[PDB]
Ligand binder design. Structure first.
Ligand SMILES: OC[C@@H]1[C@@H](O)[C@H](O)[C@H](O)c2nccn21
Ligand SMILES: [Ca+2]
Length: 736
């Protein structure tokens, strides 16, 4: 029963600065692996470390990068060569072609045309095995590149061993940051040299310098194979040596099988059938991408118990730790997918978040590996509360709540996206003003209002004092403070209470983040009825929604000074101002359900699924973003979506396959049966749940978990009478 066959690690690699089709690299890794491995086509330092259109590989690199924008840390590479012992990253490079390359989650192989070498690699969570097949040559070499900005290398010939550390990073690390690595060869060195800032030094054992490296050599027969066992650690060499045991004594074939098994274990929790090969590939590739971030950032001590280097305070402490995710992205549906299908994994992650707070003073928003300045909002609140409300409960609930309250009245002194920038204005006025030097003020307000509803939900659940509950119940309505009755849109508001003038609904950034008013107005996840009312009723609301799709993709880009890829991605799509390639508008289509018109959602969701996702190297319509854009497709292909994390609800869309089966960790299974599904039959004519007629526009977490069968009768005509009743509507705070 194999699903890995459908996973294309190359999907999203054909991307540029100007137009993203994913901005991914081939992550050769275990699910949520501490260390990822990738072929490297880019130069050292370039966020675009692998691009499909590149012709040369120059190394096989350990990487932790979550995006080309955030860039990398804990990074070093290995490169087999023939002829001269050359360290230079250009001179050592080799031409290759994609037809000479095999990429899967558990195994990567490539043929290096300028050296006549085959490279294979199979990783575990923290370690990896390389196998190099060399040609007949007197002078065959392996290059180890510890990268620049301060590193260390040491050759240990009595053990066919090279060790070292790397420090090049992109911010967000303590002063003592190091990644310690160990490499063991099965073949003795006949040549050895370390490299000091590009200068080759034969029989010198050790370097401590800006850019350290090593070159070892030997004679090879035709087809002779040399294996290299590699592990790394954020704690020490001794711990890197312990991590190495993950490999046991396995060879390439045995480790590949183990990795294939670990991926089939997780991918196979969702079985789809009755689709075409494009759909299978697109689905499972998206699922693979949803099971990578945040990465494990903990290691195992001698008793098999988790310990971690703190990317927050630089100490080595007990317990879980994860990193490399921006909650601004992944609150939306990535983490919800974990709460539905992988709750035991999120349990580890949530414990890790308690540790971020204890070690740093704040919950993270963007972490890579420590706090990084990027995006907006206080959406850790959604993550933390959603997990708790769906039965993923940390040990220390006391600290959990305190951490949440802390975030509402503090901003990190060095990292402005950590905590709530503008909390003082927000707490006092009910919004962050447009004219007080706090950029992206309207986006901050709207997301905080939602984050406060999340806190309200937990405070109520925890039976906090009525005063606290009331405060957050009030703050949750702060989205009303930026609604402009005249345009029916959200609008920047001045400190004096006047609306910002002149108002451009089509202007990106400024008051908003990477979007305009037409994208951000819909950010009222917890109260769509409230928004419906603000607009003057469901008919007007639907009119506003339809117009998003109907207009040209005209924009105003003056806040950025250039057509950023996010805007360009939107212009080429021919779907009006529906900017699906970015996060803010991603839940929007599901809002049709709340207005009593689910057939419109069914239509537009099928459009997006068919057109905006392809399984090739240019498969996405914009940045993939650590699982968010991928997990969107996974949920939407299943036929539902967590519009409002922190509720128990999944809002109905339209399924893509004829059959889908979910295998929950509790041992129950759900069958979603849509036997008449096709390219033409994308409307839901009727639905039943275990025999009972089901006309509601939503499904509940605990009902899903019980198991059984959902039957969906597909049709090529919209049913105008189903899901229009009040009791069919999903949750709105205003009705509560
Ligand atoms: O990757 C960092 C952030 C993302 O978290 C976010 O999705 C945003 O769209 C974006 N554009 C460029 C970089 N970023
Ligand atoms: Ca994005």
């Amino acid at each position: 029963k194999d699903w890995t066959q459908y996973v294309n690690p190359l999907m999203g690699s054909q991307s540029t600065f100007e137009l993203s089709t994913g901005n991914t690299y081939p992550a050769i890794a275990r699910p949520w692996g501490m260390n990822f491995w990738t072929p490297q086509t880019g130069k050292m330092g370039d966020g675009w470390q692998y691009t499909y259109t590149a012709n040369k590989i120059r190394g096989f690199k350990q990487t932790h990068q979550p995006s080309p924008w955030i860039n990398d840390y804990g990074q070093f590479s290995i490169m087999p060569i023939v002829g001269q012992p050359v360290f230079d990253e250009e001179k050592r490079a080799s031409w290759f072609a994609h037809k000479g390359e095999v990429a899967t989650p558990y195994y990567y192989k490539v043929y290096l045309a300028e050296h006549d070498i085959v490279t294979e690699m199979t990783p575990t969570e923290r370690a990896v095995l390389f196998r190099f097949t060399f040609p007949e040559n007197d002078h065959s070499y392996v290059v180890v590149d510890a990268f620049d900005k301060g590193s260390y290398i040491k050759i240990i010939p009595e053990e066919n061993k090279i060790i070292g550390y790397t420090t090049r990073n992109s911010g967000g690390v303590p002063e003592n940051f190091k990644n310690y690595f160990i490499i063991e060869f099965d073949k003795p060195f006949t040549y050895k040299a370390t490299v000091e800032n590009g200068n080759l030094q034969e029989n010198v054992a050790e370097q401590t310098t800006d850019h350290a490296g090593a070159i070892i050599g030997f004679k090879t027969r035709k087809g002779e194979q040399v294996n290299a066992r590699i592990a790394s650690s954020f704690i020490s060499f001794e711990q890197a040596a312990a991590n190495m045991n993950e490999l046991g004594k396995d060879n390439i074939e045995q480790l590949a099988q183990k990795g294939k098994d670990a991926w089939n274990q997780v991918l196979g929790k969702i079985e789809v059938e009755g689709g075409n090969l494009d759909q299978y590939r697109t689905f499972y590739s998206c699922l693979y991408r949803s099971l990578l971030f945040p990465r494990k950032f903990y290691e195992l001590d001698a008793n098999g118990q988790p310990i971690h280097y703190s990317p927050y305070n630089g100490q080595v402490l007990p317990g879980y730790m994860f990193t490399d995710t921006g909650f601004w992205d992944t609150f939306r549906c990535l983490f919800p997918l974990l709460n539905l299908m992988y709750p035991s994994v999120n349990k580890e992650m949530q414990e890790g978040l308690i540790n971020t707070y204890l070690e740093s003073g704040f919950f993270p928003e963007w972490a890579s590996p420590g706090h990084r300045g990027c995006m907006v909002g206080n959406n850790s609140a959604s993550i933390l509360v959603d997990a708790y409300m769906k039965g993923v409960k940390v040990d220390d609930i006391k600290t959990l709540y305190e951490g949440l309250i802390h975030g509402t009245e503090n901003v990190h002194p060095e990292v402005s996206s950590t905590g709530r920038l503008g909390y003082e204005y927000y707490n006092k006025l009910g919004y962050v003003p447009y004219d007080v030097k706090i950029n992206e003020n309207a986006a901050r307000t709207l997301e905080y209002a939602y984050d406060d509803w999340c806190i309200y939900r937990l405070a109520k659940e925890l039976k906090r004092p009525k005063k606290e509950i009331s405060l957050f119940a009030k703050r949750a309505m702060n989205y009303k403070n930026l609604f402009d009755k005249e345009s029916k849109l959200m609008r920047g508001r001045n400190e004096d209470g006047t609306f910002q003038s002149p108002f451009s609904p089509l202007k990106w950034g400024d008051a908003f983040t990477e979007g305009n008013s037409w994208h951000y107005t819909w950010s009222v996840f917890h109260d769509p009825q409230g928004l419906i009312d603000l607009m003057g009723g469901k008919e007007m609301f639907v009119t506003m929604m339809d117009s998003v799709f109907a207009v040209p993709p005209i924009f105003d880009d003056s806040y950025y000074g250039q057509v950023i890829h996010e805007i360009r991605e939107m212009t080429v799509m021919n779907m009006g101002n529906y900017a699906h390639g970015n996060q803010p508008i991603q839940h929007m289509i599901y809002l049709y359900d709340y207005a009593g018109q689910p057939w419109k959602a069914q239509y537009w969701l099928r459009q997006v699924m068919d057109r905006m996702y392809t399984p090739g190297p240019d498969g996405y319509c914009g940045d993939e973003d650590n699982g968010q854009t991928s997990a969107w497709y996974v949920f939407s292909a299943l036929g539902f979506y967590p519009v409002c994390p922190g509720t128990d609800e999944y809002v109905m869309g339209t399924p893509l396959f004829k059959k889908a089966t979910l295998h929950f960790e509790n041992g129950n299974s759900l069958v979603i049966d849509a036997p008449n599904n096709s390219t033409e039959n994308f409307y839901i004519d009727s639905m039943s749940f275990n025999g009972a007629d089901h006309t509601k526009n939503y499904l509940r977490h605990e009902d899903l978990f019980k198991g059984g069968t959902i039957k969906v009768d597909m049709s090529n005509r919209p049913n105008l009478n189903r899901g229009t009743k009040e009791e069919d509507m999903p949750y709105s705070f205003s009705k509560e």
